[PDB]
Design an enzyme around this catalytic site. Structure first.
Site: not given
Lengths: 106, 435, 86, 435, 435
Positions: B101, B151, B153, B155, B179, B181, B272-273, B305
């Site tokens: 804080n 990845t 597609k 998604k 991978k 999504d 994953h970020r 990532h």
């Protein structure tokens, strides 16, 4: 459009056309230049599950030129024609193999 | 009694770099003593209970102020926190004590944590990565080259079976990985258990075909901690080498019990970020990504990532891979960090790249990284299987050219066009994604 | 254009609401997937009866329905099916 | 094909208000279609896999653009997301799908989520608060009046026993509650299990003394999910009515498994809003607190920190307490939110208040709130026990004056000074904290 | 104060249609206000405790009365119940609150629940079907055609091994499924565990023979909830794609814990409608089957027995399969029901059909249904294997004729007879079951 044919592939540098003995010499020159230890490995059958091949002699700790690694390649090729053979490069600082590619098919 | 410049940091101490923007009419000394206080044993008034406990030993204090060049009411603050006051093997506390804080303080408009140094003594309490780079290459039997991911597609939309077939055609061509999504969890249209069963049939199929070890990241991220462990019990049961998780969204405590479990069971975890862009975007406000990257390496993680390309990005990439990294202010690194034999985390490059960015990404990231093509493989004129062989041959061409001793900055467009001559699949893709 | 149609047209436009008319063939009606036809956010009776006779004829053998839209945020108040397939 | 103004929002749909600042030379239509796309089924290129799944049904779309008055390249965007695409009873997904990577987009410099509406259909999947206001007052047997809490100072330094005694003197005077600081976890100087045992001896002591139900918030926040549950097993074991947690820092998934457990066991949970000031501070960038307040009410929580005082603060206070709240653009509320019988969360007021702010805070917050004095009780000339009776008599004076029918804005300084005549403890505190 | 005609129903409200027959000398208003009261917050006297709780908000009320044409003291009552007063994800409560003890009221001789509407908000709390139609076809790899099941006769008598062989010969010919009878549980003559082991040997045998995925519904219905789960642990262990349950007889709570378990493990569940005929038979008294069919879809179930044929049966068939169904009073449907993306349940047609009813059942039920032959397959002149090939060739003939574009109402007898020419097995069965 074209359909992709079914091919049995062999780890690194297998999607490129089969390597000439000059292209072989340049890739081992890179091993001795970075300071890694080049070695020869042979196995009877090539499968994704097995991760230890039969080691050819010793890792060549005293390797000055890339021609000494080529002469070890041809003597194993002569001894085992019906074997899979590949050349690897051990690093001593990071404790891991840098390069692994297949040179002769049975 | 919080601002003490003469103080000299110890080795067993956690040090932090804050970019401070005070309210006008606020001195550079008081706003620095206020964030040093409000993070650790700080109160707005003098209370009587402070005379029984030894306040001098525990308190964090500001030892150095540096004014930011070409900026008014903008300066860098260096604060030192004694080692004892944080709990052992928990990111949750170090995050909670420091950046709690001190943000949303009335004395200051904008605040940004730039960096964070970990003494080696604190680094030892954690597990860190369940495996690391060296360990990970050995389980998969892959050497020399960057690893190739994909990845699927779109998604959200495909059925569990259609997902199972779209994954089969990609690893068949010659991708290492596929991978899930970041927003697919347990959607009504495809339940997780069905998706987990069909992906199992397609990996074993393409494994016995091409003759290589193949994988797929099975997103495990779940609302509760029972469900998460129970879904993972099923992935271990189908003999899956890898799964994946989003650490920011699930929380650090969720990500923690998982990593302990994953080291217990010997499954590799992708991270994953997701939701990074809201904190680390603004250069005046938030926390820099390099802080969160460290925090990840320590929490544990085999992949991460990093984002696609520059001077800043190579700062926190060499920070996650190297055992020892030196202070470099131009790169973006404020402190000397030393990792105690802790294994490295592999860089993951994903987000809008084609076969022409191929020379640029092997040279910068190097050898120990994963290159992931979302739109670049599926959108091939000829389908998923030719689109895969396209990206495979283009990587292996640059890796062979690099060894022989060619500069890929100079002869970068040259090696892609030579390779395009003997392979039909790269000739139609060179055409489509132009310059 | 029935007596029920123009009273609802007048009831919708007497609220300050705008009319949207939507059609659907029998197959996509399963999943409640309708679409807009003609001009949206209609605020008078004669624009409503003209594009109603445009859409009764443009998509004959489809469902057609009239929407009363409160222009504040575009909130859906009242939905009524006028035309059904044969 | 993402920007569609003619669209009229349905009732089973989640609606969002974004304050957008585009890059110059970027139209108002394209930057609006880009955040509507990039949050849900959005890709930079046309891919072939989009023709098998029905893209029209699932896609989020912008239906209304409003330019911000007196601001250039600044306008409010209204986007509607179909109900089906989010997973059931998880904040983690709704957070992940919408505000994922629409932030840090190259098309736009600054972005801020202002508000978020929940359709009633989605609201039902969650547990929400484990108890709520009505339930909570009934377990503690306290009616009429705002509840009084106390934060022990200093934050880090005191031994487990010294902590145990500093808590004993405060509840003895006549405080309802005592509270652990947000950065105390399992510090080397006082371990959690020792702190948990001494606080247990001091509550039972002051319970049998004054003859009222007393409590203390035992901070449970832990690095891993095992430790968190295991510490809580011990608080239940010493028969503690309340514990507390920091939700932002531990993560939403950590906070979730806890609340399920807490409803299972009938312990009241306090939530501290640690690390809020870094996101919600900037009026051009971040997410507004009211979004996070909703997200808390839905995750679950019996108490929540709201921050001390104005037109904006009463917006999200009446939003957490009332069953039904109406759209008011001046207050700060963009959408009509309707809660389906879900219990209310009690407002917690803490941060730098003394016995003269006493008339101001009973009138604005009303009756259903907790008033917490960090520096205002301990720093009494006469100690912790007189400092408590000071704040107790000053609250009860304003609550009696309010019922009879006096304006506390007009006669606010008047009721405090009448009460100061027959009680010695308030006469020495009126002196010290002046105007 | 229960009869209020002016009331306009809300969207988040459950609505019910009752066919009422009052005792003579009872007005149409008082008997309608009495069933609206006695189901929800209703008492014969005024009690004092009603002035502390808000009765107006919670009470169910009759808003519309419609007299039944051509019937004296017979009229349709429409009552609306606020959403809040029911517990979440439990058929047990909704069944209990409404149709509890409004039946057997002295004011009325006969009472019948015709229909029941679910607001979308309430529908979301349930799991519903563990898979659905779309999911189920994908696990079995069967497209285009209705699926073919078989009931082994006699019902009780055969040994565990004789059962094992009688199931082997049927799936060998080319049936999709085999089925256990509704009264076989753990009978002394064949224990469940023995029956479960021999059926496992015969499926693996005929799977490797014909080269298709085959199944058998293993009746799991058990007296206690331990036994039920423990028998199912064994069916999962022999890798069985399907089991089956009787929901009415075991109860809704038994059927519930099962369906949760089944979605957890990815096993498809068949539901038999045993003991339906005692409630839904009488047109003046009971509950209509369509109410119970809804109740099943929400409880969960991948298959359901619908019964053999007409205007009424297609009413509740299109109600279980379709996502959106419209009000049709002639069909028998009183309310507009809207399902929130909830998967559909597959129709099961069983009870006294032969190879001549084959044209009639493909046209009316359509493509997404299961056709089951109890007496029609075993009672073939030549045995079980030819009797199976008889029904298989007769289905595939009608499906091919339908696609090309032939009306199966006019040319129904024609396609069966021109198929009888090249297959010997259908020529002897056409002979036997004549007209």
């Amino acid at each position: 459009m074209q359909t992709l044919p079914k091919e049995r592939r062999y780890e690194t540098l297998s999607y490129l056309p089969p390597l000439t003995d000059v292209q072989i010499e340049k890739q081992v020159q890179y091993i001795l230049s970075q300071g890694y230890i080049p070695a020869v490995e042979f196995n009877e059958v090539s499968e994704p599950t097995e991760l230890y091949w039969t080691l050819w002699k010793l890792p060549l700790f005293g390797a000055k030129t890339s021609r000494e690694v080529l002469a070890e390649v041809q003597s194993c090729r002569s001894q085992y024609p019906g074997h899979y053979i590949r050349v690897v490069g051990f690093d001593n600082i990071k404790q891991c193999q840098i390069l692994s590619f297949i040179v002769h098919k049975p | 009694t919080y601002y003490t410049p003469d103080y000299t940091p110890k080795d067993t101490d956690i040090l932090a770099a804050f970019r401070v923007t005070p309210q006008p009419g606020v001195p550079f000394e008081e706003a620095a003593a206020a964030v040093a206080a409000e993070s650790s044993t700080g109160t707005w008034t003098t209370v009587w209970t402070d005379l029984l406990t030894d306040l001098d030993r525990y308190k964090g204090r500001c030892y150095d102020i540096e004014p930011v060049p070409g900026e008014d009411n903008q300066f860098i603050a260096y604060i030192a926190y004694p080692l004892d006051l944080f709990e052992e093997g928990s990111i949750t506390n170090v995050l909670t004590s420091i950046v709690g804080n001190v943000f949303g303080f009335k004395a200051l408009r904008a605040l940004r944590l730039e960096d964070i140094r970990f003494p080696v003594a604190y680094i030892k309490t954690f597990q860190g990565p369940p495996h690391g780079i060296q360990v990970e290459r050995d389980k998969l039997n892959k050497y020399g080259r960057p690893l190739l991911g994909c990845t699927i597609k779109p998604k959200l939309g495909l059925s569990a079976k259609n997902y199972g077939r779209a994954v089969y055609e990609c690893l068949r061509g010659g991708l290492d990985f596929t991978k899930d999504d970041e927003n697919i969890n347990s959607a009504p249209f495809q339940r997780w258990r069905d998706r987990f069963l069909f992906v199992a049939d397609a990996i074993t199929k393409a494994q016995a075909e091409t003759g290589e070890i193949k994988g797929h990241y099975l997103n495990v991220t779940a609302p509760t901690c029972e469900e998460m462990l129970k879904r993972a019990e099923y992935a271990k049961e189908l003999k899956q080498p890898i799964i994946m998780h989003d650490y920011l969204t699930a929380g650090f405590t969720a990500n923690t019990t998982l990593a302990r479990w994953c080291r217990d069971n010997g499954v590799l975890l992708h991270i994953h970020r997701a939701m990074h862009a809201v904190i680390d975007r603004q250069k005046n406000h938030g926390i820099h990504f390099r802080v969160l990257a460290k925090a990840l390496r320590l929490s544990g993680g085999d992949h991460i990532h990093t984002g696609t390309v520059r001077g800043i990005t190579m700062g926190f990439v060499d920070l996650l891979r190297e055992n020892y990294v030196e202070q470099d202010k131009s790169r973006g690194i404020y402190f000397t960090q030393d990792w105690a034999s802790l294994p490295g985390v592999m860089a993951v490059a994903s987000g809008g790249i084609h076969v022409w960015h191929m020379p640029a990404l092997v040279e910068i990231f190097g050898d120990d990284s994963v290159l992931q093509f979302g739109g670049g493989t599926l959108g091939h004129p000829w389908g998923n299987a030719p689109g895969a062989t396209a990206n495979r041959v283009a990587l292996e061409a640059c890796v062979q050219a690099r060894n022989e001793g060619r500069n890929l900055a100079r002869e970068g467009n040259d090696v892609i066009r030579e390779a395009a001559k003997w392979s039909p699949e790269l000739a139609v893709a060179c055409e489509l994604w132009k310059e | 254009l029935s007596l029920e149609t123009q009273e609802q047209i007048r009831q919708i436009l007497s609220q300050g609401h705008k009319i949207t008319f939507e059609h659907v063939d029998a197959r996509r009606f399963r999943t409640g997937s309708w679409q807009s036809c003609g001009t949206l956010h209609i605020d008078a009776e004669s624009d409503a009866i003209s594009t109603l006779e445009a859409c009764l004829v443009d998509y004959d053998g489809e469902y057609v329905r009239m929407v009363g839209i409160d222009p504040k945020g575009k909130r859906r108040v009242v939905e009524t099916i006028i035309q059904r397939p044969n």
